[PDB]
Amino acid sequence: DMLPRENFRPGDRVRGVLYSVRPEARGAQLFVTRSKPEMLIELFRIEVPEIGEEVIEIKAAARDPGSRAKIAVKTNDKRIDPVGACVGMRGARVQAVSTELGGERIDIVLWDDNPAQFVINAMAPADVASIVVDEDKHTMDIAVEAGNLAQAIGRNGQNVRLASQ
Amino acid sequence: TVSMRDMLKAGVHFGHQTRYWNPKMKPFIFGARNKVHIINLEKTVPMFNEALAELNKIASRKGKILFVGTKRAASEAVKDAALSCDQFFVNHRWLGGMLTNWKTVRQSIKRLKDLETQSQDGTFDKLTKKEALMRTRELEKLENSLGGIKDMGGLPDALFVIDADHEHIAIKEANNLGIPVFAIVDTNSDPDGVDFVIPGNDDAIRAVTLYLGAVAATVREGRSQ
Amino acid sequence: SMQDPIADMLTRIRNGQAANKAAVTMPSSKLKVAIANVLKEEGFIEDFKVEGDTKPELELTLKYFQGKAVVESIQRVSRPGLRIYKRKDELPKVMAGLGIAVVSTSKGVMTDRAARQAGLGGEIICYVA
Amino acid sequence: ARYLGPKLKLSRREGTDLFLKSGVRAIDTKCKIEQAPGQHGARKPRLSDYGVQLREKQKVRRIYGVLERQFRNYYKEAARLKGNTGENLLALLEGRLDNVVYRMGFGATRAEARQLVSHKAIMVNGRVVNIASYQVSPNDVVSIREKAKKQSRVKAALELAEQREKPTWLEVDAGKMEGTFKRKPERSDLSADINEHLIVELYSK
Amino acid sequence: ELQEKLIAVNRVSKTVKGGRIFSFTALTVVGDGNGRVGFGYGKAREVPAAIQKAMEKARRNMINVALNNGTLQHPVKGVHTGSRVFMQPASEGTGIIAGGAMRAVLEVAGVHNVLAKAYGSTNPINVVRATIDGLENMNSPEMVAAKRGKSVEEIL
RNA sequence: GUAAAGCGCACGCAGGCGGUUUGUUAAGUCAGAUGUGAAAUCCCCGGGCUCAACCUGGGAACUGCAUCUGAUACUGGCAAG
């Protein structure tokens, strides 16, 4: 349930969503898993003041935990910077929120009315010349230059997986 | 979807007296019978249809609709409409800054919820009689005000309104935030704040009901889709 | 008394634009007609229509793009009180070229750019933006 | 006609390293480069709009070692000339003979270069030029004369330069001790930290 | 990414039975160095709080401005209350030639090159508003083309 | 309108401005040319004093005035409506 590389030590606090109490010998004990996207989602909910008041809505939160993450959010018709409000001063929300995950590489991303734009805005940070998504079998096909492709793919397809997810 | 004949039967075509009109409603007016303004059903119907379509579309993307009507004649009906399509509503007085000042009103909602829980799920009873009474009163107050919107969570993605002049505060709020507005707008009302104006009789009960029902149906359809 | 007809026409147009009037009618004159034509060419109005024999009425049909009016500004420059004549080098550029300046030249009334192209200046009637 | 005082003080005042000392020893070791000069150094309240501009102007002036009237004249010239004003000004500044020499690497500091120029060490197209403000043109070869070629300081300067990045707009020969001013530098070739625009604004009061 | 400049801060008083209650008004303006600008006017008993409020205000209700490269698209007048403002597009290198509150708004907006005079009143709050208005009204060539039913080459 | 500022109200000479159509004129207006608008100064590209100031070659400019030849939409004159 923990990170692969991030090793905890005593004196370090950890916040997580607990999900099970399995009855062991001589009574049960609490168990958590501080690696889900629920953890970063609630962390940004406790972080952003516009998240509670419905000025902006969190459309999708996608995380490869500890490694790399991309969440797409939009403003609920206020002409408001969702990345600027969910970022704080100089990243001072999300770079603090990444400290909740233990070093997450998180990207707040834009989203628009039509789903096509959302998918095109979920390919950041990478430009997209054209996108041919299949209307039948959910198989959006994005096409651009090699330079953007590398950034649109990432290490083990993180960006692709994130966007796809 | 909704026919012209039905509308006529309801009393949509009737408007307010000529001295109380707004000249911004001059396009939607047809004529004046017995010194009372008649709304043009030829211009109304298509607009209404369009509005309905829009609503349906909104529903389809899991949009939150808010039904506003604080006339007190059609308070019962609007609530019913809301509940049929399991959507939210404000059938009693609109709290000034319900949407613009959501974050404060979110606290109120929470409080109300807590009160409800105390009333129902706790089953504790054993409370000082005056205090208990006070609590009950508070609960009643909350229910009346924020009963429909308690499960709304955030802000709505569209706003259906039964009277534009009466609910101008709501409309204004929706404009400031940019929420789409779907107002029923009689001849006395102002259509400028409204996005999807519906020229029709706000006052008559049957007409109001008709307006509600179709909308509800469309929302349901959207949900189904 | 009525002293400047072109000016009056311009004013009328402006008022129409303000008040969201579809079409604006006025008593016709040749110069006025020419101006209207020019405007149409430059795309600030939809169409103009003169009608009548004894006392004909010019009717312009105003244009509205995305709610708001097309004729953002429209000022007389020459006026009976104080006439303005420009030489082809001194001809203005309204809104840094985005607007037009109606200028009456020896070869008829035309936009400023047109006049420049021709190689001639004249009486500057109005700026339109 | 020259600033003869403490050089590092100026740098401190500015905030940045102005390159007023050779660069053998790092500036942080020689002085408290972060702390401003004088009794009230540690205190640092945010400056005014005018003040920032003034500071910027000073920085540039300090860097090249140009007094105010001269600077003003240069600015005026730039304004007169076609193209971007600040850029033009920068180019003009660069064009100074002493500056060019420094760039080449015959002077450790700009001051040193200036001194050399003064003392009839440098030639421009085989003619001894003594003026530090002399605007060196494109394709104008500039060299150390045979008398001053034996000096140990010159070689040291060259060495220092070699450690320092080479400018693209020149071409210098260490053995021959002659450099060709190939072209007037582009803005991209110069340092990005200099806000020329502020300077321009200051004089456009 | 957003840059934010506190233009002015002013102490304002309210007389009460006891004496004078003082407070502070902060006028700020924020922009992304492109078209987007927004001013905010915040008020509080202490300065920093007021400033913060102003900033918050600014960050919502922004406005877009069509910018031809670093400068404006054509000379534009903007008025609001006493402050009437003229601003004129200018060649690369010239810098923001403008005074006070007006300058700040321009800078955030990401205009680099302007010639701008503030006639009339120079009351910061009004003048910034005026500037904003001017920016807002200013139409682009493309926009004008769209309006008029023409191509961009027809307009030049 | 309330900040300084609408004659107390009219008639009315001089003056200013003048609905609409056609014709004509070509005064205003515009175009081109010619003559002139001293040199220096200013500005542009150059050259010479080591650089600069300074000196200096050529240009541009001197927004005007006069005359000649056109243009005639607009303003004016004259003639008819």
Short mmCIF file of C-alpha atoms in Angstrom, two decimals, chain A residues 24 26 126:
data_model
loop_
_atom_site.label_atom_id
_atom_site.label_comp_id
_atom_site.label_asym_id
_atom_site.label_seq_id
_atom_site.Cartn_x
_atom_site.Cartn_y
_atom_site.Cartn_z
CA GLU A 24 -6.68 -10.52 13.68
CA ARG A 26 -6.52 -10.79 20.07
CA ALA A 126 2.07 18.33 -25.22
#
